[PDB]
DNA sequence: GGCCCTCTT
DNA sequence: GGCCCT
């Protein structure tokens, strides 16, 4: 349990929204030691400048071929499609991907905590569903997770708690590369660099094992 | 298809208590106002800006009880509710006890089933508190088989801003509520807010009603 | 799809 | 009724 040593910012892109029984099309992890986060110094400004990511970070970004077509809306905003992913030789969500995730997580200082925007309702349940289809034991065993919407709400102290709304509320600039996995992870990181010590305290208190996350859907 | 069928009775509920959740509060007052769904189906459409406060239905069952808590009220609680443990006892009020459970069961039992409790911030206060108080008793729960919904969630859906009871009431009707922080007063205020868009409320309630047995107690007890 | 709706005394 | 995720 806490204190959490590493925060792993997570974002998934997929074929659609949960009622559609979606499948992952892109995945990004950005791992940062809690020290790098608290070391961030939001410079003077009105609006405050967007902080640079810490120098020392681990990053993984992967495109994934789904077993079903993206919804038109999902394709439009992500810039991905099943057809393009296939011709670019992307592989399905498979055992080897699970091995990659575990190895990546395992070289992070422990314990780790996944951080995703609306994670409790989307990213974590969806990820649980994808992993459940595999033969590998869950690569996220021992890993914790929190939802940054819950975090940001509690840290205050609004019309919207969407990723973009929060970012703009803080920095009054548009996020870049929205609805791309890496783009959204970097945006989330910038938000979480605003008041890192308060965030880390909240994370330490509210982090729960990823293994407690119920799958989005069950594929009986 | 509706998850639990039509809710035939809406039971507007409010509690007064010794304090707020972190204090392990105990109930000091309880009011139930039971209304057949038809009384809501029969409520007039709210027209005008502002509309008048809806007329309460003629046919209603009401229960309002003052209850001696097991601990003193916080000074803040006493100030706003006008109740204190000592004075409730001077007035000979009984504790939240087996008798009360039997009373509540009988009251609910002559309502058409199923019943759905409606309380403002009920999901985070009234329902968990009531669950805790009933859990203390050896008597079986009189609320098994009943459903519940939070009217904050309801009014947010219906309004499509503060969502305190008084704020909503004032926003809809341009009037100050009366007898705030009394159980019966707040129940009548709640009734009025829920009568604003009565057909839409009923549909939302039917869609979001959840079994009371799924409500987690506010706090644990020896 | 599931839960949240920051108020409650 | 819509968040909020795609
Ligand atoms: Co679409
Ligand atoms: Co009937
Ligand atoms: Co209506
Ligand atoms: Mg996302
Ligand atoms: Mg994204
Ligand atoms: Mg109340
Ligand atoms: Mg009250």
| CATH number of the domain residue A70 falls in | 3.30.420.10
User: What is the spatial distance, in angstroms and rounded to an integer, between the CA atom of A66 and the C1' atom of C7?
Assistant: 43
A218 occurs within a structural domain: no
Q: Residue A153: which nucleotide is closest by CA–C1'?
A: C6
Chain C nucleotides near the protein (CB, 7 A): 1-9
B165-173 and B183-194 helices, crossing angle to 10°: 50
- Say if B222 falls within a structural domain: no
Confirm whether A57 is domain-assigned.
yes
Contacts within 8 Å (CB) and 24+ apart, A137-142: A138/A98, A138/A210, A138/A211, A139/A98, A139/A99, A139/A101, A139/A102, A139/A105, A140/A101, A140/A102, A140/A105, A140/A114, A140/A210, A140/A211, A141/A210, A141/A211, A142/A110, A142/A111, A142/A112, A142/A209
DSSP A131-163: HHTSSSPPTTTT-EEEEHHHHHHHT------SH
CA of B109 to the centre of ligand 6 (A): 24
| Residue tagged active-site, from B4, B49, B120, B181 | B181
- Total domain count for chain B? 1
Q: Residues A46, A117, A179, A206: which is the catalytic one?
A: A179
Q: Which two tokens stand for residue A180?
A: 């791309």
B181 assigned to active site:
yes
- Resolution of the experimentally solved model in angstroms: 1.7
* Any strand D atom closer than 7 Å to A119 CB: no
Question: What residues contact B215, with CB distance under 8 A and at least 6 apart?
Answer: B123, B127, B128, B130, B131, B148
A12 in any annotated domain: yes
CB-based burial label for B68 (10 Å; 0-12, 13-18, 19+): buried
Q: How far is the CA of A166 from the centre of ligand 5 (A)?
A: 15
In whole angstroms, D4 C1' to A13 CA is: 14
In a domain, A219, yes or no: no
∠B133-B134-B135 over CA atoms, to 5°? 90
Determine the Cα–Cα distance for residues B156 and B93; give it in Å rounded to an integer: 37
Q: Within a 10 A sphere around the Cβ of B149, how many other Cβ atoms?
A: 24
Q: Is residue A75 part of a domain?
A: yes
Any domain includes B138: yes
Q: What is the DSSP letter of A105?
A: H
For chain B, the three-class secondary structure string (H helix, E strand, C coil) is: CCCCCCCCEEEEEEEEECCCHHHCCCEEEEEEEEEEHHHHHCCCCCCCCCCCCCCCCCCCEEEEEECECCCCCCHHHHHHHCCCHHHHHHCCCCECCHHHHHHHHHHHHCCCCCEEEEECCCCCCHHHHHHHHHHHCCCCCCCCCCEEEEHHHHHHHHHCCCCCHHHHHHHHHCCCCCCCCCHHHHHHHHHHHHCCCHHHHHHHHHHHCEEHHHCCCCCCCC
Ligand nearest to C-alpha A179 = 5
| Dist. CA B117–CA B209, nearest whole Å | 9
B207 CA to C6 C1' in angstroms comes to: 23
User: Contacts for B86-95 with beta carbons within 8 Å, 24 or more apart?
Assistant: B88/B28, B91/B66, B93/B66, B93/B67, B93/B68, B94/B67, B94/B68, B95/B67, B95/B68, B95/B69, B95/B70
CB burial of residue B208 (10 Å; 0-12, 13-18, 19+): middle
Strand partners, B17: B27
B126 marked among binding-site residues: no
Q: Report if residue B168 sits inside a domain.
A: yes
Handedness of CA A96, A145, A15, A67 (dihedral sign): positive
Cα(B100)–Cα(B105) distance, rounded to whole angstroms?
8
Q: Which letter does DSSP use for residue A218 in this model?
A: -
Are the beta carbons of A38 and A200 closer than 8 angstroms? yes
The answer to whether the beta carbon of residue B208 comes closer than 7 angstroms to any atom of strand D is yes
Residue nearest to nucleotide D3 (CA to C1'): A160
CA B57 to centroid of ligand 4, rounded, Å: 48
Q: Find residues whose C-beta atom lies within 7 angstroms of strand C.
A: A 17-19, 118, 121-122, 153, 216-217; B 14-21, 25, 28, 74, 76-77, 80-81, 120-121, 123-125, 150, 152-153, 156-157, 161-167, 181, 186, 208
- Taking Cα atoms as reference points, which of B196, B209, B220 lies closest to residue B54? B196
Residue ranges of the annotated binding site of A for substrate are 13-14, 122, 184
CA/C1' separation A148–D4 (Å) = 12
Tell me how the structure was determined.
X-ray
Asked if residue A150 lies in contact with residue A174, where contact means CB atoms within 8 angstroms, the answer is no
Structural domain boundaries, residue A97: 3-213
Residues contacting A76, CB < 8 A, separation 6+: none
């Amino acid at each position: 349990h806490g204190h959490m040593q590493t925060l792993i910012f997570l974002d998934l892109e997929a074929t659609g929204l949960p009622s559609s029984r979606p499948e992952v099309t892109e995945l990004c992890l950005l791992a940062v030691h809690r020290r790098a986060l608290e070391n961030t110094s939001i410079s003077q400004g009105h609006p405050p400048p967007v902080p640079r990511p810490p120098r020392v970070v681990d990053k993984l970004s992967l495109c994934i071929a789904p077993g079903k077509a993206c919804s038109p809306g999902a394709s439009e905003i992500t810039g991905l499609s099943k057809a393009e992913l296939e011709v670019q030789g992307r592989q399905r969500f498979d055992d080897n991907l699970a091995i990659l995730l575990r190895a990546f997580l395992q070289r992070q200082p422990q314990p780790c905590c996944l951080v995703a925007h609306n994670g409790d309702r989307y990213d974590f349940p969806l990820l649980q569903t994808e992993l459940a289809r595999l033969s590998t034991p869950s690569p996220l065993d021992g890993t914790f997770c929190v939802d940054s919407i819950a975090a940001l709400k509690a840290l205050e102290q609004r019309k919207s708690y969407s990723l973009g709304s929060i970012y703009t509320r803080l920095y009054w600039q548009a996020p870049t590369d929205s609805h791309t996995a890496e783009g959204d992870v970097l945006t989330l990181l910038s938000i979480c660099q605003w008041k890192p010590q308060a965030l880390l305290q909240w994370v330490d208190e509210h982090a729960r094992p990823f293994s407690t996350v119920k799958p989005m859907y069950g594929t009986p």
